[model samples]
Target: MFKDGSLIPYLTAGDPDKQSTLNFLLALDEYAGAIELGIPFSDPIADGKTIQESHYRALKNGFKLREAFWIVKEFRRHSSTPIVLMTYYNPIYRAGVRNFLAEAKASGVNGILVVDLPVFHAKEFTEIAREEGIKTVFLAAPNTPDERLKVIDDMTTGFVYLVSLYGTEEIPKTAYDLLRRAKRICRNKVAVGFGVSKREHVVSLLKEGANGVVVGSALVKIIGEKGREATEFLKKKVEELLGI
Candidate 1:
């Protein structure tokens, strides 16, 4: 969890190359309250085009799960920014909860977000993660019912990821309503995302009581345009996003 008004940027590991990702992560460390590092899952139904391509590029270039750890390990050498791995459940399930969480702990990871894991079915995994000192994150959609929203809040160990719709935009006006509902229900911090690439999105959501704001594809596109040197541009972008 972060202080109010945290700016979280999502980055895919091994996009362009692992070394490039490592370079970007260190730079991202300075501005981001927390980093959501995408693990390049083969299928990401929730991701938009920019992130999907980054994932594809990462896998095509032979990015290993081990390398994700190595990237974090390397990043730990230089920074201590909070990092939460944004990956689908298949990889974690295949790797087994205990071993996967154990390795994550070894790599100095702070949290894990299994995109598709239902709150009803996550106790086993979350318990193990808690034991390993890794936090478990949960996503809450705008349409998620009150009954279920309460459960998501109770289950979430880290910040609550609030997404009214899957995005890869300007925030839909309705998303603010979603944030309102999430705030009413989630005791955990609500971090709204999904097409949140602009300052107004962040300002609007925070004004409405969101605890954090997540930006991904916009920053990912920056990495695509700037290559390994995206950091300088990203620094400017983060500052811009925060300034206005």
Candidate 2:
């Protein structure tokens, strides 16, 4: 789905309901290089308030971790757009690596991005994903050292997520340097995210040599505000970002 560079959007499963999430994907599939589907967890340490609230809503709606696989499977029946599951490690830990990886592959998932999973501690789990042909994505930051950057590069299969900022509204000056550095070291691809809410941010990152862009909080915020009209909000955002 990604060519030249990707435009990835993040969404929570069962945000309003399962069907709406599926509909949202179908509407944005053509423009999205890949979709990052979030599975609700009670406690998410790596995510900020925007995604955390969505998780709470999803959990309240009875969305389970396994349900994410079912959602992806259903969507696969209609579209071939790559689906990437984003969640914390507890659900995967409880579901067992073997079971989760096997089921994820069966559900047509292309990649897995664990917010709290560290590259230093994910050797075994990443190896398992590698065996199943599932891409293991990890995050990198501005302050990360060259040695650790190499480790992140080696561990990742899909792309290295370069965090631009925490929960802030503006992109940091250091973010561009970090993205450039990550692109140089990362063996796979480098996608920058966090605080990426505008078209200028997309153009800036791509100009800085980022292979892709992941827009989360801004998009999620729209869903939280619009509810049923979330698809139109997202479609417009996609059109604006991709110039389509």
Candidate 3:
């Protein structure tokens, strides 16, 4: 939804609890170009320690898949910034893909990224999401060749998520080339994630021509540490990181 230099903050849905998440969304509305509210997948192999901890807390609190949709509906009451749910396949599979998507659409979500579902198995999945008016996002990596990146971009209805180093702590120097290459190759917009934490990281990606940057682990850690109190802390932190 945004062009170069936009900040897209990702938080695990129900991190600590549902109310806090809504508070975070409201607090972040002014700064976020869009928000990536992730479902706490039962198996969180994709995230770093900070985010994984947030996942465990959300699950321990007994947050349900349906609750995530409700919270988004609540967040929509106050703002219109796009909400992209970053999640896994099992939840959708168990909830029934079409049924799950109906709730997602009704709740005002704009996009989805199933971290574990590759385009290989999502031929039917992508079509279903599109029919519901939800954009489908896919993850791309630094090492992906030009042709492969094209395929990922083509299937992606939302922006192509470029993982700078395949992890979400601090970005490495290699993101320079990865970001630049993605800008050159992709037909869709490219948003760099995985290791985008500080303002400098955000600036570097935009400087290299990225459409946006996704910040996750660092912000999620603060919520884990502060719970509901993270509302104010997160806003400051995001403003600090974006220098907005």
Candidate 4:
């Protein structure tokens, strides 16, 4: 149920198309411990430049919620790796929380990471997901106060996402020491996101007591450039990182 510091590849759902999305997921399944599938929305305030570009491309290509769920449902046929849906609250609310969780769980989704959905504000999401067995993981930034972090560490079930101080999906060197301490504070798996893209970065994370690294924009950028080749390319990198 935990996939931290282990290569967790993230991709924008319906990027080039659903077929390519499925291909990439299946291709990367061998090396990656879990998958983070970004459900494109009209607004992506938390994502950085690379992922923002992907969101725009998916939107232009007419990628919608149905296609995202379709890719996940089809993926369940051949894979059992944890599939965590990365999205914003608006889409989930629009889709109806109960309906979204019910369909997502039925489709074999393992967890959810609603970017702007604060744990404090996500009462309905957490309450509903608990019954459905869909873990509601949340993110904490460097600026998060200690008092709030205490609650986040307690309430969060599977993992806690540590967003590096610098920015989103743009790995930074200075974050190493800080995240090490953050990892210690989190009781469950402490997974770092928001700027990790390589093996050395993962090595650094593992060395610092972190359990997993989430690669989002990095994976999406490769897919945008290499299309199907992105799968193999990323697999090779993950293998090198995890020493598999």
Per-residue lDDT over 208-227 for candidate 3, one digit per residue giving the tens place of the 0 to 100 score: 78888888876898898889
| Candidate 1 clashes between residue pairs 3 or more apart in a chain or in different chains | none
Candidate 4 segments exceeding 4 Å error:
3-5, 118-120, 165-174
Clashes of 2: 0
lDDT of 4 by residue, 1-244 (tens): 5555577788998887777889988988877778889898888878777788788878887888978889999999998998888899899888888899888988889898888985556776788889888987788876776666667777677677777637634356546645755666778787777566656667767777777787776678787788656778877666766666
For every model shown, what is its TM-score relative to the native structure?
0.94, 0.93, 0.94, 0.90
**How far off is residue 186 in model 4, in Å?**
1.4
Q: Which ten residues in a row have the lowest lDDT in candidate 2?
A: 164-173
Q: Which segments of model 2 are wrong by more than 4 Å?
A: 118-121
Off by over 4 Å in 3: 165-170
lDDT of 2 by residue, 84-107 (tens): 888888888888886898899999
What does candidate 1's lDDT look like per residue over 84-145, in tens digits? Answer: 98898888888887899999989989999888985565888778888999998888776777
Show the lowest summed lDDT stretch of 10 residues, model 3.
164-173
Looking at model 3, the pairs that clash are none
lDDT of 3 at 144: 74
